[PDB]
Design a protein around this ligand. Sequence first.
Ligand SMILES: [Mg+2]
Ligand SMILES: [Mg+2]
Ligand SMILES: [Mg+2]
Ligand SMILES: [Mg+2]
Ligand SMILES: [Mg+2]
Ligand SMILES: [Mg+2]
Ligand SMILES: [Mg+2]
Ligand SMILES: [Mg+2]
Ligand SMILES: [Mg+2]
Ligand SMILES: [Mg+2]
Ligand SMILES: [Mg+2]
Ligand SMILES: [Mg+2]
Ligand SMILES: [Mg+2]
Ligand SMILES: [Mg+2]
Ligand SMILES: [Mg+2]
Ligand SMILES: [Mg+2]
Ligand SMILES: [Mg+2]
Ligand SMILES: [Mg+2]
Ligand SMILES: [Mg+2]
Ligand SMILES: [Mg+2]
Ligand SMILES: [Mg+2]
Ligand SMILES: [Mg+2]
Ligand SMILES: [Mg+2]
Ligand SMILES: [Mg+2]
Ligand SMILES: [Mg+2]
Ligand SMILES: [Mg+2]
Ligand SMILES: [Mg+2]
Ligand SMILES: [Mg+2]
Ligand SMILES: [Mg+2]
Ligand SMILES: [Mg+2]
Ligand SMILES: [Mg+2]
Ligand SMILES: [Mg+2]
Ligand SMILES: [Mg+2]
Ligand SMILES: [Mg+2]
Ligand SMILES: [Mg+2]
Ligand SMILES: [Mg+2]
Ligand SMILES: [Mg+2]
Ligand SMILES: [Mg+2]
Ligand SMILES: [Mg+2]
Ligand SMILES: [Mg+2]
Ligand SMILES: [Zn+2]
Lengths: 58, 78, 137, 94, 48
Amino acid sequence: AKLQITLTRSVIGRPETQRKTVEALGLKKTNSSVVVEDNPAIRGQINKVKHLVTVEEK
Amino acid sequence: SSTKNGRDSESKRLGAKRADGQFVTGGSILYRQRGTKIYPGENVGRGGDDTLFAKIDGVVKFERKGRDKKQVSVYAVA
Amino acid sequence: MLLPKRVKYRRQHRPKTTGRSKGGNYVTFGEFGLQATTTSWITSRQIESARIAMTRYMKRGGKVWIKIFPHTPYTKKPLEVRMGAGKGAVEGWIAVVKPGRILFEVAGVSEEVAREALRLASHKLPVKTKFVKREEL
Amino acid sequence: ASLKSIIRQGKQTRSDLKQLRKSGKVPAVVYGYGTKNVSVKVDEVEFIKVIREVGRNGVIELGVGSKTIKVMVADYQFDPLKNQITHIDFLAIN
Amino acid sequence: VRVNVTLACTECGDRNYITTKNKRNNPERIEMKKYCPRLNKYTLHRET
RNA sequence: CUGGUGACUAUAGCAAGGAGGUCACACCUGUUCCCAUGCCGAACACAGAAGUUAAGCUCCUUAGCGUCGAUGGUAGUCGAACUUACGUUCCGCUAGAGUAGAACGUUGCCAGG
RNA sequence: UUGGCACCUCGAUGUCGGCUCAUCGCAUCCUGGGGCUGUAGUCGGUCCCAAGGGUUGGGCUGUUCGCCCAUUAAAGCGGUA
RNA sequence: CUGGGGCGGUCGCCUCCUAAAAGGUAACGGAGGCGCUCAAAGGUUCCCUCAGAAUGGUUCAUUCAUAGAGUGUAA
RNA sequence: UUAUUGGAGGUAGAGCACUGUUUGGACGAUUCAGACAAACUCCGAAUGCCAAUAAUUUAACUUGGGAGUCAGAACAUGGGUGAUAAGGUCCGUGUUCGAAAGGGAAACAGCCCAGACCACCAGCUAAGGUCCCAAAAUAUAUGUUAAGUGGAAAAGGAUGUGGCGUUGCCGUGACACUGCGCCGAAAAUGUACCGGGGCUAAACAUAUUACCGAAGCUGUGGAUUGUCCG
Ligand SMILES: [Mg+2]
Ligand SMILES: [Mg+2]
Ligand SMILES: [Mg+2]
Ligand SMILES: [Mg+2]
Ligand SMILES: [Mg+2]
Ligand SMILES: [Mg+2]
Ligand SMILES: [Mg+2]
Ligand SMILES: [Mg+2]
Ligand SMILES: [Mg+2]
Ligand SMILES: [Mg+2]
Ligand SMILES: [Mg+2]
Ligand SMILES: [Mg+2]
Ligand SMILES: [Mg+2]
Ligand SMILES: [Mg+2]
Ligand SMILES: [Mg+2]
Ligand SMILES: [Mg+2]
Ligand SMILES: [Mg+2]
Ligand SMILES: [Mg+2]
Ligand SMILES: [Mg+2]
Ligand SMILES: [Mg+2]
Ligand SMILES: [Mg+2]
Ligand SMILES: [Mg+2]
Ligand SMILES: [Mg+2]
Ligand SMILES: [Mg+2]
Ligand SMILES: [Mg+2]
Ligand SMILES: [Mg+2]
Ligand SMILES: [Mg+2]
Ligand SMILES: [Mg+2]
Ligand SMILES: [Mg+2]
Ligand SMILES: [Mg+2]
Ligand SMILES: [Mg+2]
Ligand SMILES: [Mg+2]
Ligand SMILES: [Mg+2]
Ligand SMILES: [Mg+2]
Ligand SMILES: [Mg+2]
Ligand SMILES: [Mg+2]
Ligand SMILES: [Mg+2]
Ligand SMILES: [Mg+2]
Ligand SMILES: [Mg+2]
Ligand SMILES: [Mg+2]
Ligand SMILES: [Zn+2]
């Protein structure tokens, strides 16, 4: 019931809305990580920026 | 030669001014329009230029009327 | 054919040429047809030349249907003028053809004759074409 | 008169349908009196053989999941380019 | 319409009520009852 | 069951056939009064009750037109990858048209019976 | 080529023609090789290979261009501000 | 203002399209209109319903006719 | 910012119910069939937008002091204009440059990867790559190409070759779809678009396993400024 989200791609060259979603997930710099409880809202954020992040069931 | 065209009037910023489900005060404009594209509903007035406005404080509801017509009402928040 | 007898607006935005053919993708009046596999504008002169070729080869006797009509006018500026100062004057009339659109239909001749006539017509057109028969299961 | 169909399990994606049509199969749906709606897939060559052996308004014995229900070709979708049947509507005539 | 007019009361010295008319249509001095603030009633205001 | 009066996106409407008037509704007979026609008691209004279901109106059986309408697929397209190809690929959303099918109304009060 | 665009140059990138001197391309004017011919021969037409060399002296006009006179195997077309 | 400048055209306001289904959005882009009018063509109450077609008659009548008429004026 | 819920609106597509355009029948304008539309719509998305109450996140607004800016550019994409010309021009949307170094694209503001506090002769990766120039596979499996195609182009032409099929006569044909090649293919200082050498794979298509590769991330030490509790 917890996911670890890692920012594996740069936000450079990405539209502002994707950058805002990445910021809302708590990810700061490239290869930084967060651990958050799984719920539909977090899943929606991840789906929006899934080409930029890696998800591990943690 | 020359073009005979090149004229236009100022855009009039019509359309919805408040959202369905939003709370508004009395006198708030809900909709600017030409004609009755949307009709005045409950506790909603229709101004001289067809502007729809709330007559009470309350919550805006856009609803259908008949088959091919629409209306907007305002209902007092309980 | 040649052109509309009248149109509301003689200066029109040019049509979009991407995508596939919206309709008229089946043989519906005759036995055989010319189906476009490539996209292009088709002018009234191209239509008229293709029609003359096909009907001359068929030696009359058969029937010819032209399924596309040049509804859209297009404009051209005068030779050697700077940009701007309004849109040009109507230069010709075109139809938009996308893959799948049947251009001509024929009936009343044998299969071999239809094939030869449609090949001759297709060599006048700016699109790749394929010979098609009336579609059944 | 006889054609065998495989039930299409779940919701197919676009890629699933593309692979299906590439592999010579035709997505199809069965509906009508006496049958509940089910998505199936039949071989294109076999379907053409059956259709040429019975015609257009004919009755087809369609094996649909341990049930030999009788159907008629209500409608079908065809791609004039590449000359390929893309979808079939089997109506169970009861 | 055609020309601006001023309607005058018989008691008020104000000419508050201006309006318009068509001279060919109404060449005669038009008159109508209008509210008069200084008398607090409707009186007869006539074209000047 | 009928009527009065509301609510609902015609699933309610039109069309064709048949059944009924005990009360009720209606057609109807008239113009003295109230009222009334750019003319006419056709309408509106008023007296009524000779009569009649004939039409309106109720009831019944039809999907004929109209309306409603899936599933499946197709077009389009948010996003991603490739690419410059009148493009390809993956993913989510997903029409319009057409198909099966629904449907010859459901219901709130008030009164009568 | 006539243009379209306005990207370098306006604290300056001299414009046409000729003269002098060339250099490169080949879509070849001549010369060399060859296929077809409605190629008898002599001459031609057309296409293919080929850039080695060659490819004019005057009248008119500032002219380029062009017309003309007289030749020549031929008097080629273009690029190089 | 200006796909250099001049010459031509334009300069304020209204409507539509371009305009990418909120709003906004440019070009010497595509189309038009305004610089009024009406003493009722304003207010209110009551009543009313069109264009067209067919069919008959030396304008009238019947039937259909959701408006295909009208709405002072451009959309 | 996302989830969910509600709403406004007419684009893409589609359609022909209205307006206009158009093809072939039939009957004597209507009807059957089939098409077209920025200023057509019986319809109608995806998205975007406005809101309402959960998750994550870090802003937001007001009032004052001080500005600078009002020449923009390319790329991608929705469109006008032009010629479905321009490194053209004018709007919408996004990114980068501007004001951004580092790696890749031979060189190359605007493309791809990625945002340099300082030091290191440490490590892992991105785009892109791994025969030599020049770091890392002369890697593995299956096949295609014979054109140096790869390493700039079309209508059209052709017993080039491979995979798929529906078929006909009795080895042989017809037809349909498709992979990769061939011809069509002529320019000016010098080979002269693979960057060069070279390559029949060191080309191309699928699949897999390694490795190289940046100032990205990590490791160690240090500087400055903040936050939490030196
Ligand atoms: Mg406007
Ligand atoms: Mg007013
Ligand atoms: Mg159609
Ligand atoms: Mg030039
Ligand atoms: Mg510029
Ligand atoms: Mg200068
Ligand atoms: Mg200098
Ligand atoms: Mg040569
Ligand atoms: Mg030579
Ligand atoms: Mg020479
Ligand atoms: Mg100028
Ligand atoms: Mg002038
Ligand atoms: Mg929008
Ligand atoms: Mg808008
Ligand atoms: Mg004007
Ligand atoms: Mg004026
Ligand atoms: Mg469209
Ligand atoms: Mg038509
Ligand atoms: Mg047409
Ligand atoms: Mg439209
Ligand atoms: Mg461009
Ligand atoms: Mg530019
Ligand atoms: Mg832009
Ligand atoms: Mg920046
Ligand atoms: Mg850089
Ligand atoms: Mg760099
Ligand atoms: Mg570089
Ligand atoms: Mg290069
Ligand atoms: Mg470099
Ligand atoms: Mg380069
Ligand atoms: Mg490594
Ligand atoms: Mg190297
Ligand atoms: Mg090495
Ligand atoms: Mg090569
Ligand atoms: Mg090459
Ligand atoms: Mg070639
Ligand atoms: Mg080289
Ligand atoms: Mg290289
Ligand atoms: Mg490093
Ligand atoms: Mg760092
Ligand atoms: Zn007074």
